[PDB]
Symmetry: C2
Subunit: 115 residues, 2 copies
Amino acid sequence: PVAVQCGRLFDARSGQLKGPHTLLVADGRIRQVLPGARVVDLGDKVCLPGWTDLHVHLGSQSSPQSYSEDFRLDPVDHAFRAVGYAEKTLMAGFTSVRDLGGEVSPHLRDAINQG
Amino acid sequence: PVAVQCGRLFDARSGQLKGPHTLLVADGRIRQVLPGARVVDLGDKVCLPGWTDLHVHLGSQSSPQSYSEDFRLDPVDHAFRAVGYAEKTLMAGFTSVRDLGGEVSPHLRDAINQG
């Protein structure tokens, strides 16, 4: 159980920014949100839910050499690039993505789900 | 039966530049060379045998997009470029070439022989 103290909270269901709050996290879900356990303090920060990107291609990235790699590179190289792509995507605040094309993405999803 | 008058003749067997000469050409061969019929005058020019290039690749030419043409082009495009390549090679003074690689060059040779 982790108690996260938030200086300001954003209510996505209303689009309004509330005041200080406290979130109780247990078993990977939110237990209770109290206005006003290991303590994580973010009193001088604005808290939001994690963002979702509904159109990404985690198995590729545009490059001047992107129109010759169909005949030179292998899916394993794309997986090794996708590791860093996914880490960079997660660190930007996007905790969920919808992948819209690519043969590496299901395997990357399986690897992330397995830890 | 043409008579080519040359102001200065180069002796490829000896390597020495000779004086004015006259070449009699009939049936695609040199009939006789006379020191000193239609007439082709080159009085103020130097006459030499046609040059030979012993290493060419008439079915290709290097370019920034050369390494991607293996998967995007067909032999027909290479032949259409080789037409101009061969015309430019002939106009430069090289009446004979040895092509050392390429599967379009035998066909270009047959086409040139057929006229």
